[PDB]
Amino acid sequence: MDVLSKGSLKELLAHLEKTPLEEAISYRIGTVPYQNVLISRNEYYNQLYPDTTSLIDGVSREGQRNVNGLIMSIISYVVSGSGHYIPNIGFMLLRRSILDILTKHDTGLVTNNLNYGIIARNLTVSKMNCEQRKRMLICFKLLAYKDGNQNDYEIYLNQNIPLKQIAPNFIPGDMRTVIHNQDQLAIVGIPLTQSTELSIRDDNAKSYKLGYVDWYNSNSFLRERSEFNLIRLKDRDTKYGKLNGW
Amino acid sequence: HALIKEDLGQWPVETGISLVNQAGVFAVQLANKLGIDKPFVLDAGSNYFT
Amino acid sequence: YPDADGNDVSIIFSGAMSHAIFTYAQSQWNKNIIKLDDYIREITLTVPKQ
Amino acid sequence: ANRATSAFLDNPHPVGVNYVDEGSRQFVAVAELLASKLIDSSRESDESNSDVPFVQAYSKFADDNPRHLRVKTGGKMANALTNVIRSYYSINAPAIVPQVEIDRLASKATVSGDMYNSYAIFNSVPIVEVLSPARTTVSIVGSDRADVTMLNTGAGAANITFNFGQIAETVILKGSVPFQLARLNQPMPAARFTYKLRPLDGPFIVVLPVGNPLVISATAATRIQVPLAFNKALVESGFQTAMNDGLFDIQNVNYYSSFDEFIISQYHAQDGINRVSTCVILGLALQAYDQMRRALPVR
Amino acid sequence: ANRATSAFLDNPHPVGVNYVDEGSRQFVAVAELLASKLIDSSRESDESNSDVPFVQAYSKFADDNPRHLRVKTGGKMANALTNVIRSYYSINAPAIVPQVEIDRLASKATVSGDMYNSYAIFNSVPIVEVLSPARTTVSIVGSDRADVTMLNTGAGAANITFNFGQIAETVILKGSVPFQLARLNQPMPAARFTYKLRPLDGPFIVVLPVGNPLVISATAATRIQVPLAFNKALVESGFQTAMNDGLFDIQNVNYYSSFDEFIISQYHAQDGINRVSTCVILGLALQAYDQMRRALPV
Amino acid sequence: ANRATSAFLDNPHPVGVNYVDEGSRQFVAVAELLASKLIDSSRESDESNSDVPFVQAYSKFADDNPRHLRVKTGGKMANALTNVIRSYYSINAPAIVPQVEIDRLASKATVSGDMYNSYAIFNSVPIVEVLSPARTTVSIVGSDRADVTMLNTGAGAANITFNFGQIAETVILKGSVPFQLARLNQPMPAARFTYKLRPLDGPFIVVLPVGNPLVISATAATRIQVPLAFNKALVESGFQTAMNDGLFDIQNVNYYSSFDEFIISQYHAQDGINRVSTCVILGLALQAYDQMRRALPV
């Protein structure tokens, strides 16, 4: 809910630096990602409404234990607000922040073999709005410059002309580009009636939209009560035990 | 010998007249005596000694 | 002694009906004590959308 | 030997694994409480010929003041409840309700989400296995009251083995004519009309004579922990409404006549002790579903 | 070829046409509401240690105060409710209660006689016909759970046709042994224990192998629109009470075991929609009757 | 001649003879009233955020205050209620509860009623005997809905005698195929599907043709005087709980599936008029046991 309200590249990057990977992942099994299902939308139809599940719905789904699974969960969190279920990630990765997973080499994750075309297909980029595509391209560009695969990012953009039109105009190394960026990446925001939408993505997105006004006021006190005497998880000092399976 | 008694007063009742009617009238009096007829919050966290 | 929510629980020797009547009245009034944020939400539902 | 089993105990489909945490149990409990208030407000509205009691209850339920041009279906809470009911029934049902919605709807009232306050008695009789020799014929018919018809054709009396499982608490057997029943490796008592058995005690052998068919009627009672708001009359009515509306039309699932059979069939699975908890939650949701549709009718 | 049918579905008798209008519907709603207060007045009397709550409840229901030398009967409303129930069951029953008396009793409490603001589930399984070929025996037993016993003494497998009507919403079939069932002009699937089917789909063919008998248990669910004050448990008890008291004792009518069978049998008549509305109003009247007579036995 | 009887009608065991006086009857009514307030209070406490209604309800019921560490046994009222239920079932039960303790518990509340104020309808069908000739075979299965399957393999039509006793009010007979039934030494009518009979009319003869078997389904209704607070749904569930908790495990006793079967079996016996009085008291005790246990599981 907080990641969706960020409307600037500066605010989105600042949030990712503060947020650990734990809130990008989820601990709920969910269902299989791609599946033709019939859902009940009684506000419109007596019959069951056909739809296809995906990873863009704000609902947890099963993900494999690999770098592709971790990347998909991070992007889904940015573009949808809810991550995926990757089993037993490990303490060392969960304590790192999202941006360091995307842009730093000390995390212990190899991302040199990522295929951008396959990730977009798996994330169903076709059923994404303008804001979501921009956020996905921000994550792709950060990974591309981290591993030196800047050429592959350009090849992917050239193959997808519509994405090339709305691509972000920032260079990850430079800071002048981030300061002067003028993109609008906000998905949720204060304005809508308490009604139901037909699609799973549209219904879940509207649920975030209607709950943002209430979340703006109620989160302050309830949060502060939780970590009144709690040590911050992000970059927590430890004995640096091990990283298993990566 | 010793004992503990709860003193809530003496409220006589007439046999011929309706008991629910008398109980309702006595209920208004009892609520006023206990001070619970009007909205209130108990503030009894300060009366202690260490 | 303090409770989980921050309230103060007083344990005293008292009568049975005095405890029952007083504590029941507390529950009834507390049913209508709500947070300000919840009150604002109730108000907003009874006014036009603007 | 021949094997006979009750139809409703054959291959119970897996149940949902989502919406079973404490937050989701609170959401179902909140829905059931608010659905009940809706039906009481509907009676008060009819009696007083005013929409004030209904508007107040619908606003508390749907968080949206009713409008003439639109259609009243329960709002977002109804959408979440209906789709959550589907998820409990089968694993193949999708999980589409986000958890920001569940937490938001769980806060509309204060209720204890514990589902183990009280108990309930379910009457479905489980006959897992009836074993008969080659000369005999055995037929099992019924769910609430199982009727077992046995006919012996061979020369001598036959022994029939009854297996009632290990979950049912008590089982009462009645015969059209007096019959002989005993345990494994136990003397046969004199012929009686009715027997009371403990299914945990062991397999039971029935001596079947060669003369005339013997019909044994079985009735069982089992105890399953349920919340204090559980009401069997409402849950059963909610079950049929869900089946009629098509909420249970998922691929590769089994269909049951009543909620009695559904919960008992799921209990007798390999991991039934964990499946019953989900079914109880589905039962409370169905009771909330029943009260909600009866208050808001759609033809 | 033989055909078999459910016993309770045979020859539904015509129902009454009086006491269906708005004023009469509100009389039944008032009678149900006031009779309910009569039962609850007993619990109030226990708590209040006095008979005043009961006296108030009976005075409103009967327009007369209770007496100790008289057996409490209910007065005009009890007489009106009893006679109105008789008219509902048969068209041969007289309509004795005047309209003016109905309007006066309908003004006692504020209600709306809307009988279409809710629904109920009725569990009577309708088997209109079962068509079987020669050398095949078919027996239909039961009304709430219908058991069909099928025996094939012939040389080969037989095809038996089921017709569940066009009214029931769902029917679930559970067999003693796995069997094959399919719609007309459809291929047969693998043998399964349970089938869920919509009667509107069409006649169903079940394959009967030669050997031991096959028994199929049928459970059906039907949705009928009823008033919000409807309670199936009270209606069912009222049906048995009225039958015992002889309110249904009239020439040239049929007798049913339960109200579930009565309403479904009438719904499957030549024009069953005309009789469903009257049957539901009879249900509310019976629910009022059960409460009134249990509080005031006679 | 062959004789076939219902299973549940065979050998009703003697019912206990203690705790049936006016004072003991008052105790059961008070226990039922206090238990109902307990379960209603428990629901309100769960609905609300505070536990006041349950604390008062349990204090009145158990004569002590609830504790978070000790278990909620229900007090001496729960102990007395459990033991009297044991005594009511069989005459061989101990019945060692002092009468002074019963009177003390009966003074907690006062009840404005008795055990004969109202009535209830019981649906078990009594089939005392079915008499058949040498060649025919008759099987009776069922208690809520009796199903009598008769098959004729002789030369010609046979006559089957039905005895429904003299206690039941009305019995409804339905058949798989139309059949003829008439009273003893009376002409037979044309074949019909459903018959309505008064068991006191006399033994009934049924014409059984040679050929396919005939199955007759019987439903009966009996009226028994009960207190106004009687509820069959609560009594039936209380009956199952008592059996599961082992309150009925006594030597030389009979076991029944439902309380409806138990009360009809006792009524259809010599001195059955005196037995139903104790069975009704036991039924109301089971109502209190159900409500008390569902609020305080152990």
PDB file of N, CA and C in Angstrom, chain D residues 33 110-114 116-121 123 145 147 169-170 172 174-176 193-196 212-213 215-217 219-223 228-230, chain F residues 5 7-8 10 39 42-43 46-49 137 139-145 147 237 240-241 243-245 249 254-257 261 289-290 293-295 297:
ATOM      1  N   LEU D  33     -21.991 -12.341  12.008  1.00  0.00           N
ATOM      2  CA  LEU D  33     -22.679 -11.445  12.929  1.00  0.00           C
ATOM      3  C   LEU D  33     -23.431 -10.356  12.177  1.00  0.00           C
ATOM      4  N   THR D 110     -16.217  -6.470  16.685  1.00  0.00           N
ATOM      5  CA  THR D 110     -15.358  -7.170  17.628  1.00  0.00           C
ATOM      6  C   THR D 110     -15.981  -8.519  17.970  1.00  0.00           C
ATOM      7  N   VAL D 111     -15.294  -9.595  17.587  1.00  0.00           N
ATOM      8  CA  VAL D 111     -15.760 -10.954  17.827  1.00  0.00           C
ATOM      9  C   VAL D 111     -14.544 -11.840  18.040  1.00  0.00           C
ATOM     10  N   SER D 112     -14.708 -12.850  18.885  1.00  0.00           N
ATOM     11  CA  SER D 112     -13.667 -13.848  19.083  1.00  0.00           C
ATOM     12  C   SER D 112     -13.713 -14.837  17.929  1.00  0.00           C
ATOM     13  N   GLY D 113     -12.617 -14.943  17.194  1.00  0.00           N
ATOM     14  CA  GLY D 113     -12.578 -15.815  16.046  1.00  0.00           C
ATOM     15  C   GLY D 113     -12.326 -17.269  16.353  1.00  0.00           C
ATOM     16  N   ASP D 114     -12.336 -17.653  17.626  1.00  0.00           N
ATOM     17  CA  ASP D 114     -12.034 -19.028  17.992  1.00  0.00           C
ATOM     18  C   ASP D 114     -13.174 -19.940  17.567  1.00  0.00           C
ATOM     19  N   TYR D 116     -13.515 -23.213  18.491  1.00  0.00           N
ATOM     20  CA  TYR D 116     -13.537 -24.388  19.352  1.00  0.00           C
ATOM     21  C   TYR D 116     -14.209 -24.095  20.689  1.00  0.00           C
ATOM     22  N   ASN D 117     -15.142 -23.143  20.717  1.00  0.00           N
ATOM     23  CA  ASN D 117     -15.911 -22.899  21.933  1.00  0.00           C
ATOM     24  C   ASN D 117     -16.824 -24.074  22.253  1.00  0.00           C
ATOM     25  N   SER D 118     -17.576 -24.548  21.264  1.00  0.00           N
ATOM     26  CA  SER D 118     -18.624 -25.527  21.511  1.00  0.00           C
ATOM     27  C   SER D 118     -18.462 -26.746  20.616  1.00  0.00           C
ATOM     28  N   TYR D 119     -19.474 -27.608  20.597  1.00  0.00           N
ATOM     29  CA  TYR D 119     -19.464 -28.827  19.808  1.00  0.00           C
ATOM     30  C   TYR D 119     -20.793 -28.966  19.078  1.00  0.00           C
ATOM     31  N   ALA D 120     -20.847 -29.935  18.170  1.00  0.00           N
ATOM     32  CA  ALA D 120     -22.071 -30.258  17.453  1.00  0.00           C
ATOM     33  C   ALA D 120     -22.073 -31.744  17.137  1.00  0.00           C
ATOM     34  N   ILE D 121     -23.264 -32.288  16.911  1.00  0.00           N
ATOM     35  CA  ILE D 121     -23.453 -33.710  16.650  1.00  0.00           C
ATOM     36  C   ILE D 121     -23.892 -33.883  15.203  1.00  0.00           C
ATOM     37  N   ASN D 123     -24.905 -36.722  12.150  1.00  0.00           N
ATOM     38  CA  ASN D 123     -25.601 -38.000  12.174  1.00  0.00           C
ATOM     39  C   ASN D 123     -25.228 -38.946  11.040  1.00  0.00           C
ATOM     40  N   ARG D 145     -29.332 -42.603   7.696  1.00  0.00           N
ATOM     41  CA  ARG D 145     -29.666 -43.915   8.233  1.00  0.00           C
ATOM     42  C   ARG D 145     -29.329 -44.948   7.173  1.00  0.00           C
ATOM     43  N   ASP D 147     -29.035 -48.474   5.447  1.00  0.00           N
ATOM     44  CA  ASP D 147     -29.753 -49.741   5.397  1.00  0.00           C
ATOM     45  C   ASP D 147     -28.894 -50.759   4.659  1.00  0.00           C
ATOM     46  N   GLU D 169     -18.460 -41.806  17.289  1.00  0.00           N
ATOM     47  CA  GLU D 169     -18.441 -42.029  18.729  1.00  0.00           C
ATOM     48  C   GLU D 169     -19.295 -43.225  19.121  1.00  0.00           C
ATOM     49  N   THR D 170     -20.540 -43.269  18.654  1.00  0.00           N
ATOM     50  CA  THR D 170     -21.425 -44.387  18.940  1.00  0.00           C
ATOM     51  C   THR D 170     -22.177 -44.772  17.675  1.00  0.00           C
ATOM     52  N   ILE D 172     -25.586 -47.370  16.591  1.00  0.00           N
ATOM     53  CA  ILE D 172     -26.700 -48.199  17.032  1.00  0.00           C
ATOM     54  C   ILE D 172     -27.188 -49.013  15.844  1.00  0.00           C
ATOM     55  N   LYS D 174     -29.899 -51.828  14.357  1.00  0.00           N
ATOM     56  CA  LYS D 174     -31.212 -52.427  14.520  1.00  0.00           C
ATOM     57  C   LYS D 174     -31.483 -53.366  13.356  1.00  0.00           C
ATOM     58  N   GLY D 175     -32.124 -54.491  13.654  1.00  0.00           N
ATOM     59  CA  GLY D 175     -32.402 -55.504  12.658  1.00  0.00           C
ATOM     60  C   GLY D 175     -33.893 -55.718  12.485  1.00  0.00           C
ATOM     61  N   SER D 176     -34.287 -56.057  11.255  1.00  0.00           N
ATOM     62  CA  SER D 176     -35.679 -56.405  11.001  1.00  0.00           C
ATOM     63  C   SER D 176     -36.079 -57.647  11.785  1.00  0.00           C
ATOM     64  N   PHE D 193     -32.531 -57.556  19.055  1.00  0.00           N
ATOM     65  CA  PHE D 193     -33.042 -56.650  18.035  1.00  0.00           C
ATOM     66  C   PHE D 193     -32.134 -55.448  17.809  1.00  0.00           C
ATOM     67  N   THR D 194     -31.574 -54.883  18.874  1.00  0.00           N
ATOM     68  CA  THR D 194     -30.763 -53.679  18.780  1.00  0.00           C
ATOM     69  C   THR D 194     -29.452 -53.862  19.532  1.00  0.00           C
ATOM     70  N   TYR D 195     -28.369 -53.368  18.937  1.00  0.00           N
ATOM     71  CA  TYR D 195     -27.050 -53.386  19.547  1.00  0.00           C
ATOM     72  C   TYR D 195     -26.497 -51.969  19.578  1.00  0.00           C
ATOM     73  N   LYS D 196     -25.737 -51.665  20.628  1.00  0.00           N
ATOM     74  CA  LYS D 196     -25.009 -50.409  20.734  1.00  0.00           C
ATOM     75  C   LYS D 196     -23.520 -50.715  20.721  1.00  0.00           C
ATOM     76  N   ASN D 212     -33.908 -66.131   5.302  1.00  0.00           N
ATOM     77  CA  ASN D 212     -34.552 -64.925   4.805  1.00  0.00           C
ATOM     78  C   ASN D 212     -33.581 -63.759   4.847  1.00  0.00           C
ATOM     79  N   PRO D 213     -33.787 -62.747   4.005  1.00  0.00           N
ATOM     80  CA  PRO D 213     -32.887 -61.590   4.013  1.00  0.00           C
ATOM     81  C   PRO D 213     -32.936 -60.846   5.337  1.00  0.00           C
ATOM     82  N   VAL D 215     -32.049 -57.158   7.101  1.00  0.00           N
ATOM     83  CA  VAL D 215     -31.806 -55.736   6.885  1.00  0.00           C
ATOM     84  C   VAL D 215     -31.387 -55.126   8.212  1.00  0.00           C
ATOM     85  N   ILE D 216     -30.212 -54.507   8.232  1.00  0.00           N
ATOM     86  CA  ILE D 216     -29.672 -53.865   9.423  1.00  0.00           C
ATOM     87  C   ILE D 216     -29.664 -52.363   9.184  1.00  0.00           C
ATOM     88  N   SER D 217     -30.287 -51.617  10.092  1.00  0.00           N
ATOM     89  CA  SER D 217     -30.341 -50.164  10.019  1.00  0.00           C
ATOM     90  C   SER D 217     -29.345 -49.587  11.015  1.00  0.00           C
ATOM     91  N   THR D 219     -27.426 -46.165  12.727  1.00  0.00           N
ATOM     92  CA  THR D 219     -27.465 -44.741  13.031  1.00  0.00           C
ATOM     93  C   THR D 219     -26.250 -44.402  13.881  1.00  0.00           C
ATOM     94  N   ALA D 220     -25.575 -43.305  13.547  1.00  0.00           N
ATOM     95  CA  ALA D 220     -24.350 -42.911  14.219  1.00  0.00           C
ATOM     96  C   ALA D 220     -24.436 -41.468  14.690  1.00  0.00           C
ATOM     97  N   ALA D 221     -23.590 -41.138  15.662  1.00  0.00           N
ATOM     98  CA  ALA D 221     -23.469 -39.779  16.171  1.00  0.00           C
ATOM     99  C   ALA D 221     -22.009 -39.498  16.480  1.00  0.00           C
ATOM    100  N   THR D 222     -21.498 -38.387  15.960  1.00  0.00           N
ATOM    101  CA  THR D 222     -20.116 -37.984  16.167  1.00  0.00           C
ATOM    102  C   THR D 222     -20.069 -36.517  16.565  1.00  0.00           C
ATOM    103  N   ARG D 223     -19.022 -36.156  17.302  1.00  0.00           N
ATOM    104  CA  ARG D 223     -18.878 -34.825  17.875  1.00  0.00           C
ATOM    105  C   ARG D 223     -17.742 -34.086  17.186  1.00  0.00           C
ATOM    106  N   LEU D 228     -19.561 -21.080  18.893  1.00  0.00           N
ATOM    107  CA  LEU D 228     -20.820 -20.939  19.613  1.00  0.00           C
ATOM    108  C   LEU D 228     -21.943 -20.416  18.731  1.00  0.00           C
ATOM    109  N   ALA D 229     -21.621 -19.761  17.621  1.00  0.00           N
ATOM    110  CA  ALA D 229     -22.639 -19.245  16.717  1.00  0.00           C
ATOM    111  C   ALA D 229     -23.099 -20.272  15.695  1.00  0.00           C
ATOM    112  N   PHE D 230     -22.527 -21.472  15.708  1.00  0.00           N
ATOM    113  CA  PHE D 230     -22.894 -22.501  14.746  1.00  0.00           C
ATOM    114  C   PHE D 230     -24.354 -22.901  14.915  1.00  0.00           C
TER     115      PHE D 230
ATOM    116  N   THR F   5     -42.544 -57.286  13.544  1.00  0.00           N
ATOM    117  CA  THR F   5     -42.753 -56.103  14.361  1.00  0.00           C
ATOM    118  C   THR F   5     -41.597 -55.135  14.162  1.00  0.00           C
ATOM    119  N   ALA F   7     -38.477 -52.947  15.201  1.00  0.00           N
ATOM    120  CA  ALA F   7     -37.394 -53.275  16.121  1.00  0.00           C
ATOM    121  C   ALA F   7     -37.476 -52.447  17.396  1.00  0.00           C
ATOM    122  N   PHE F   8     -37.770 -51.154  17.271  1.00  0.00           N
ATOM    123  CA  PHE F   8     -37.753 -50.271  18.431  1.00  0.00           C
ATOM    124  C   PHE F   8     -38.935 -50.486  19.363  1.00  0.00           C
ATOM    125  N   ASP F  10     -39.751 -53.420  20.644  1.00  0.00           N
ATOM    126  CA  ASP F  10     -39.556 -54.693  21.327  1.00  0.00           C
ATOM    127  C   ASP F  10     -38.957 -54.463  22.710  1.00  0.00           C
ATOM    128  N   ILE F  39     -26.621 -20.276  27.994  1.00  0.00           N
ATOM    129  CA  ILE F  39     -26.180 -20.323  26.603  1.00  0.00           C
ATOM    130  C   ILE F  39     -26.438 -18.989  25.911  1.00  0.00           C
ATOM    131  N   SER F  42     -23.658 -16.735  27.016  1.00  0.00           N
ATOM    132  CA  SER F  42     -22.381 -17.069  26.393  1.00  0.00           C
ATOM    133  C   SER F  42     -22.277 -16.474  24.996  1.00  0.00           C
ATOM    134  N   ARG F  43     -23.374 -16.492  24.241  1.00  0.00           N
ATOM    135  CA  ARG F  43     -23.358 -15.908  22.906  1.00  0.00           C
ATOM    136  C   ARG F  43     -23.144 -14.402  22.960  1.00  0.00           C
ATOM    137  N   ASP F  46     -19.489 -13.614  23.716  1.00  0.00           N
ATOM    138  CA  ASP F  46     -18.676 -13.782  22.517  1.00  0.00           C
ATOM    139  C   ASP F  46     -18.892 -12.632  21.542  1.00  0.00           C
ATOM    140  N   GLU F  47     -20.144 -12.195  21.383  1.00  0.00           N
ATOM    141  CA  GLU F  47     -20.434 -11.084  20.483  1.00  0.00           C
ATOM    142  C   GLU F  47     -19.802  -9.790  20.978  1.00  0.00           C
ATOM    143  N   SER F  48     -19.855  -9.545  22.283  1.00  0.00           N
ATOM    144  CA  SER F  48     -19.319  -8.325  22.861  1.00  0.00           C
ATOM    145  C   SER F  48     -17.851  -8.512  23.233  1.00  0.00           C
ATOM    146  N   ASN F  49     -17.279  -7.494  23.866  1.00  0.00           N
ATOM    147  CA  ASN F  49     -15.889  -7.518  24.292  1.00  0.00           C
ATOM    148  C   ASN F  49     -15.730  -7.806  25.778  1.00  0.00           C
ATOM    149  N   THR F 137     -43.478 -63.106   2.168  1.00  0.00           N
ATOM    150  CA  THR F 137     -42.392 -62.640   3.022  1.00  0.00           C
ATOM    151  C   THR F 137     -42.543 -61.143   3.247  1.00  0.00           C
ATOM    152  N   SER F 139     -40.799 -57.710   5.317  1.00  0.00           N
ATOM    153  CA  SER F 139     -39.677 -57.120   6.034  1.00  0.00           C
ATOM    154  C   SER F 139     -40.020 -55.686   6.400  1.00  0.00           C
ATOM    155  N   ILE F 140     -39.823 -55.332   7.667  1.00  0.00           N
ATOM    156  CA  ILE F 140     -40.079 -53.987   8.168  1.00  0.00           C
ATOM    157  C   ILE F 140     -38.747 -53.347   8.524  1.00  0.00           C
ATOM    158  N   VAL F 141     -38.464 -52.199   7.919  1.00  0.00           N
ATOM    159  CA  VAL F 141     -37.231 -51.464   8.177  1.00  0.00           C
ATOM    160  C   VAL F 141     -37.568 -49.985   8.306  1.00  0.00           C
ATOM    161  N   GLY F 142     -37.106 -49.366   9.376  1.00  0.00           N
ATOM    162  CA  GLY F 142     -37.269 -47.938   9.532  1.00  0.00           C
ATOM    163  C   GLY F 142     -38.103 -47.587  10.752  1.00  0.00           C
ATOM    164  N   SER F 143     -37.809 -46.425  11.329  1.00  0.00           N
ATOM    165  CA  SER F 143     -38.540 -45.905  12.477  1.00  0.00           C
ATOM    166  C   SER F 143     -39.206 -44.573  12.182  1.00  0.00           C
ATOM    167  N   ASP F 144     -38.474 -43.614  11.610  1.00  0.00           N
ATOM    168  CA  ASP F 144     -39.090 -42.348  11.224  1.00  0.00           C
ATOM    169  C   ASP F 144     -40.050 -42.539  10.058  1.00  0.00           C
ATOM    170  N   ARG F 145     -39.655 -43.337   9.070  1.00  0.00           N
ATOM    171  CA  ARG F 145     -40.514 -43.704   7.949  1.00  0.00           C
ATOM    172  C   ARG F 145     -40.401 -45.207   7.753  1.00  0.00           C
ATOM    173  N   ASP F 147     -40.771 -48.770   6.186  1.00  0.00           N
ATOM    174  CA  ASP F 147     -40.835 -49.285   4.824  1.00  0.00           C
ATOM    175  C   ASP F 147     -41.081 -50.784   4.901  1.00  0.00           C
ATOM    176  N   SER F 237     -30.846 -33.453  20.318  1.00  0.00           N
ATOM    177  CA  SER F 237     -29.401 -33.292  20.416  1.00  0.00           C
ATOM    178  C   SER F 237     -28.906 -33.612  21.820  1.00  0.00           C
ATOM    179  N   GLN F 240     -28.497 -37.440  22.145  1.00  0.00           N
ATOM    180  CA  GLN F 240     -27.262 -37.969  21.582  1.00  0.00           C
ATOM    181  C   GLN F 240     -26.074 -37.692  22.491  1.00  0.00           C
ATOM    182  N   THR F 241     -26.018 -36.497  23.079  1.00  0.00           N
ATOM    183  CA  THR F 241     -24.915 -36.164  23.973  1.00  0.00           C
ATOM    184  C   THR F 241     -24.911 -37.062  25.204  1.00  0.00           C
ATOM    185  N   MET F 243     -26.005 -40.123  25.423  1.00  0.00           N
ATOM    186  CA  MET F 243     -25.522 -41.438  25.017  1.00  0.00           C
ATOM    187  C   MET F 243     -24.011 -41.442  24.827  1.00  0.00           C
ATOM    188  N   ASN F 244     -23.470 -40.401  24.191  1.00  0.00           N
ATOM    189  CA  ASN F 244     -22.031 -40.341  23.966  1.00  0.00           C
ATOM    190  C   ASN F 244     -21.271 -40.191  25.277  1.00  0.00           C
ATOM    191  N   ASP F 245     -21.784 -39.374  26.195  1.00  0.00           N
ATOM    192  CA  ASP F 245     -21.165 -39.215  27.504  1.00  0.00           C
ATOM    193  C   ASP F 245     -21.367 -40.421  28.403  1.00  0.00           C
ATOM    194  N   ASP F 249     -25.287 -46.182  30.054  1.00  0.00           N
ATOM    195  CA  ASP F 249     -24.639 -47.494  30.077  1.00  0.00           C
ATOM    196  C   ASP F 249     -24.983 -48.193  31.388  1.00  0.00           C
ATOM    197  N   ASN F 254     -32.330 -51.199  27.134  1.00  0.00           N
ATOM    198  CA  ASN F 254     -32.442 -51.109  25.689  1.00  0.00           C
ATOM    199  C   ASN F 254     -31.950 -49.748  25.215  1.00  0.00           C
ATOM    200  N   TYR F 255     -31.389 -49.722  24.009  1.00  0.00           N
ATOM    201  CA  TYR F 255     -30.830 -48.509  23.433  1.00  0.00           C
ATOM    202  C   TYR F 255     -31.606 -48.135  22.181  1.00  0.00           C
ATOM    203  N   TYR F 256     -31.950 -46.856  22.061  1.00  0.00           N
ATOM    204  CA  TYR F 256     -32.750 -46.346  20.962  1.00  0.00           C
ATOM    205  C   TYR F 256     -31.972 -45.275  20.208  1.00  0.00           C
ATOM    206  N   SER F 257     -32.318 -45.106  18.932  1.00  0.00           N
ATOM    207  CA  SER F 257     -31.609 -44.150  18.088  1.00  0.00           C
ATOM    208  C   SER F 257     -31.987 -42.708  18.394  1.00  0.00           C
ATOM    209  N   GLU F 261     -38.140 -42.312  19.272  1.00  0.00           N
ATOM    210  CA  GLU F 261     -38.337 -43.754  19.365  1.00  0.00           C
ATOM    211  C   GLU F 261     -38.473 -44.201  20.812  1.00  0.00           C
ATOM    212  N   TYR F 289     -29.464 -30.372  29.707  1.00  0.00           N
ATOM    213  CA  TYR F 289     -28.136 -30.954  29.563  1.00  0.00           C
ATOM    214  C   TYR F 289     -27.474 -30.498  28.270  1.00  0.00           C
ATOM    215  N   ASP F 290     -28.251 -30.391  27.191  1.00  0.00           N
ATOM    216  CA  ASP F 290     -27.710 -29.924  25.919  1.00  0.00           C
ATOM    217  C   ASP F 290     -27.213 -28.490  26.035  1.00  0.00           C
ATOM    218  N   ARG F 293     -24.141 -28.097  28.378  1.00  0.00           N
ATOM    219  CA  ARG F 293     -22.887 -28.668  27.902  1.00  0.00           C
ATOM    220  C   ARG F 293     -22.318 -27.874  26.737  1.00  0.00           C
ATOM    221  N   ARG F 294     -23.178 -27.370  25.853  1.00  0.00           N
ATOM    222  CA  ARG F 294     -22.691 -26.583  24.727  1.00  0.00           C
ATOM    223  C   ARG F 294     -22.090 -25.263  25.188  1.00  0.00           C
ATOM    224  N   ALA F 295     -22.521 -24.757  26.343  1.00  0.00           N
ATOM    225  CA  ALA F 295     -21.922 -23.553  26.902  1.00  0.00           C
ATOM    226  C   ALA F 295     -20.676 -23.871  27.719  1.00  0.00           C
ATOM    227  N   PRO F 297     -18.325 -26.940  27.622  1.00  0.00           N
ATOM    228  CA  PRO F 297     -17.756 -28.233  27.227  1.00  0.00           C
ATOM    229  C   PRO F 297     -16.637 -28.658  28.163  1.00  0.00           C
TER     230      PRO F 297
END
